[PDB]
Design a protein around this ligand. Structure first.
Ligand SMILES: Nc1ncnc2c1ncn2[C@@H]1O[C@H](COP(=O)(O)OP(=O)(O)O)[C@@H](O)[C@H]1O
Ligand SMILES: Nc1ncnc2c1ncn2[C@@H]1O[C@H](COP(=O)(O)OP(=O)(O)O)[C@@H](O)[C@H]1O
Ligand SMILES: [Mg+2]
Ligand SMILES: [Mg+2]
Lengths: 551, 551
């Protein structure tokens, strides 16, 4: 057999999200369908479907009121929190009050519906998960997720909840700066006391953290920064600068066409990125306003000057952080750049100048470091079952065939489509009865293609996939059914069996027990009894480890 | 060294039980093996073994007559009490008369046996204890247990007895509503007179209590409610509603198949829970009756209407409670939701409407609040030895290794298995003699694996664990021996030593004195003499505190 299924590491960001996995001695930051190693934390709702990530951020100009972003800022907070109310006047989507809990309110297929920030976030998570499963070729259940160090118990729990919704087992919620240091192996290289500063300049926020690490244990000493200072503000500057130039050169105002503004803003996003590895950046848009083309350029120097106040303002939070730790600049051993905006040579130069030309740790991609760290720690927690004598009888080799055909959630189901699929169900249960397993699978596929929203379809196909020694395939079908209806008992029964087939001991015991509560089977009952001693020996050993690292 | 062993807080419920612990500045409500933060108060007996909690509630449909629940209703009562006789006609297990004491009578491994309600309850307690010990990684002896405020001296003592059977030292029996208020810190926030109402809607019962708290002392002003109004009745409604719909849609009666009824009932339990956080709930069962699938849904609105009379009836006990306190609605400062059924938006709305849209205290999980309070008060009572100059010589660091291999109580011991284990005993006593301690432990483990019911095995292994500075491990073995045979003197001798090794002063003095009565040792005798001054200074200080709070 090959390796067990890996655990993923996820950076759930305010502006972008990022996922990694540790395999064959190294972390892989995973690229999504559109090719990018990071994904906008965006969810959009429309007339026909739900959009997530790049597709959601790209159509914003067209659908500004049902395109949700910045769910991280709401997460774990009260509608009555001054921060939320302060925030609500900058977003173009509606936020409503639900018993002192905030919910984003949108239009979605001609009906109004609302979502807790944990729900929005769980939609992002799901996407990240899906990105990883496409890379790996198999279903993922276990994750590590990161949060800012300033996150209270409320926001932490809320971030775990979002994971649980997206079908993840959350192994650990860990601090973003802590994730960064783990990435730079600042825990395992050292045999003495070292003090560490994480300069995190992201898309929406700026975070300075000083951490102390002795004996391989992280302790947060100070936190600071600005929860409203990010790369998105620099885009404002460029945008503001160019609108004004457009007035000057072309004698027209463009502020009021939203679509022309975005087109400018996205052009500016790209331009700012090029200005990190080039001194100059060209900027061409076909037909910006009333048929007028905009061809222009900008220099690094000029960009720097437009953001003048902003860039300089990242040294004050540094000053304040040392001040809270009771440390002098000289006393920090390690400087670490994370966040995508730290790609900006000026922002780099300013920091190095504060530390008198000392070397910055930046070999690890600054926008990938958090996820990187998260993946390493995910690998360690899973890795912990190495130390235990676990009997591996009954475990089989992971099936690797390509993902079977699923439904289409949003495709139109006709009245006749309900029946034709309904018949197929009965025809496939006959092939299982008779003993021709592939035929049973094949007609369930015709059933599912025709009715993609009947949850028993997926569960029953999953049953057949198990008889066929294809547990991953079953896990997939059960994952879908449980999405459609988390209350039906069948899918838990079969996912339990599938997990057990794969040595996923803790996963098997959760499902088989849940299946037994909802709908008692003698079989599942014994499966669970057979499964428990493995799950609790693993769980006890992981808990012990974490207690040792809680000190 | 780490912290001393914590005391647990236990909510011994009519329908569910719940355990918590206070550590590192906060209460942890502890999850059981199957993942749930609450455990059904169920004990089942069968052909081969004894089942407790979720496993007991899940197989009910299969074994209705030897599956015991509602022991709380019998506890502390006379067979001749009209309540018991009234109750006996709703249960499917047998209750018998034993000198005007009631005992539940069951089949258990092909023999008929009977159990006092305190014994049934002590089986639940044990489970809770075991849940906590798995979480903590070490044996627990000290607990706080909760009871309803209407409990007489008889029922209180009986509840303490059940704790004592399960091997707990019962620090305090405290009122459930009092536990709830302690959880909401309604004792320590206030510097004036405040009046408090606890609206407790559980699984079997409804409790309204009004409490007055000045100077940090709780006083019960009034009690009311219905000892037969709970969540289990709402399940009746849903079940009744669906059976009737099944007749209507599918032209068949299902009342007579018990297994189909339960499957419906458990489906309904889940559905009712979803209807707390969703307006609608889907309901799928594979093959309900004679091969017919039941796929159907229900709305929140509809559920509300089915329970119409029931929900509305919780305001009368409120009315009556104020009336007994001589208070108007306006005069209550604090409203507190506890009980799992208070998760129901309708039940919430009705209450708030009686108090004219005023805020309810519900931030603490309504089904976890009682246990929560109990854990806090457990922490205070233990915490009391902070104020005393206790000399800590001879105390060593708690051993944290994983739990050693125990027996299997219910596994079949062959005649040959008695001898092979018997030899191993003699072989291990030789390794102790010679001085190789691990070998002695290892061969006792082979002895125990082969004969899991000889109590001297466990005691002798415990002796070796002590020589090895692993007192927790010893405590475990002694706990087991004393379960098998509470009269043998050896285990008390060694548990005494182990406790003393850990600073468990009062625990050490109980065991060492009991060991000295049954079988006098010069060594244990001096251990006890050495141990007494510590135990009695602690005991005197806890007693004083409680006297101050008895006023
Ligand atoms: N090469 C680059 N040059 C300049 N800015 C960049 C570059 N790459 C990313 N950024 C900026 O970094 C921000 C995203 O930061 P990141 O750490 O990836 O996400 P988050 O802040 O959500 O954690 C965006 O504003 C983006 O414009
Ligand atoms: N989310 C929920 N929605 C509706 N009812 C619930 C929910 N959670 C628990 N309950 C109900 O609460 C009851 C258990 O109450 P609880 O306080 O936990 O136990 P006890 O009443 O034994 O003290 C059960 O009938 C259960 O159906
Ligand atoms: Mg970030
Ligand atoms: Mg209760």
């Amino acid at each position: 057999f090959m390796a067990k299924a890996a655990a993923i590491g996820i950076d759930l960001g305010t502006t972008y999200s990022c996922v990694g996995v540790f395999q064959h001695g190294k972390v892989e930051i995973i690229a999504n369908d559109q090719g990018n190693r990071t994904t906008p934390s965006y969810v959009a709702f429309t007339d026909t479907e739900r959009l997530i990530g790049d597709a959601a951020k790209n159509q914003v100009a067209l659908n500004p009121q049902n395109t949700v972003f910045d769910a991280k800022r709401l997460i774990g907070r009260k509608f009555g929190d001054p921060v939320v109310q302060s925030d609500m006047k900058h977003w173009p989507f509606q936020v409503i009050n639900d018993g002192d809990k905030p919910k984003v309110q949108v239009s979605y297929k001609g009906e109004t519906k609302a979502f807790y920030p944990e729900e929005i976030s769980s939609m992002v998570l799901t996407k990240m998960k899906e990105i990883a499963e496409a890379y790996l070729g198999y279903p993922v259940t276990n994750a590590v997720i990161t949060v800012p160090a300033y996150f209270n118990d409320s926001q932490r729990q809320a971030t775990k909840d979002a994971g649980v919704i997206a079908g993840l087992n959350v192994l650990r919620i860990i601090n973003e700066p802590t994730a960064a240091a783990i990435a730079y192996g600042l825990d395992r290289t050292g045999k003495g006391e070292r003090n560490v500063l994480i300069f995190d300049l992201g898309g929406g926020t700026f975070d300075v953290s000083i951490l102390t690490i002795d004996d391989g244990i992280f302790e947060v000493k100070a936190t600071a920064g600005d929860t409203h200072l990010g790369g998105e503000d620099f885009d404002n500057r460029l945008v503001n600068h160019f609108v004004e130039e457009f007035k000057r050169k072309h004698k027209k105002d463009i502020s009021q066409n939203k679509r022309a503004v975005r087109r400018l803003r996205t052009a500016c996003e790209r331009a700012k990125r090029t200005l990190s590895s080039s001194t100059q950046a060209s900027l061409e848009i076909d037909s910006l306003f009333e048929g007028i083309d905009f061809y222009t350029s900008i220099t690094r120097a000029r960009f720097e000057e437009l953001c003048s106040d902003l860039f300089r303002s990242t040294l004050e939070p540094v000053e304040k952080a040392l001040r809270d730790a009771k440390l002098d600049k000289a006393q920090i051993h390690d400087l670490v750049l994370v966040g995508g905006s730290t790609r900006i040579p000026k922002v780099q130069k300013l920091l190095q100048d504060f530390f008198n030309g000392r070397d910055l740790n930046k070999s690890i991609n600054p926008d990938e470091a958090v996820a990187y760290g998260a993946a390493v720690q995910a690998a360690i927690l899973m890795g912990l079952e190495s130390d235990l004598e676990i009997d591996n009888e009954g475990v089989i080799e992971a099936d690797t065939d390509a993902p079977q055909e699923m439904g289409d959630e949003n495709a139109e189901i006709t009245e006749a489509m309900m029946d034709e699929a309904n018949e197929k169900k009965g025809a496939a249960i006959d092939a299982l009865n008779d003993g021709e397993l592939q035929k049973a699978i094949d007609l369930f596929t015709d059933a599912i293609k025709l009715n993609p929203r009947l949850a028993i379809l997926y569960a029953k196909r999953a049953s057949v996939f198990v008889k066929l020694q294809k547990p991953n395939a079953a896990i997939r079908d059960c994952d879908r059914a449980i999405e459609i209806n988390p209350d039906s008992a069948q899918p838990y029964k079969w996912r339990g069996k599938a997990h057990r087939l794969l040595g996923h001991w803790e996963e098997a015991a959760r499902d088989l027990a849940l299946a037994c509560k909802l709908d008692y089977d003698e079989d599942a009952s014994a499966m669970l009894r057979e499964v428990q001693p493995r799950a609790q020996k693993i769980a006890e050993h992981r808990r012990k480890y974490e207690r040792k690292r809680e000190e």
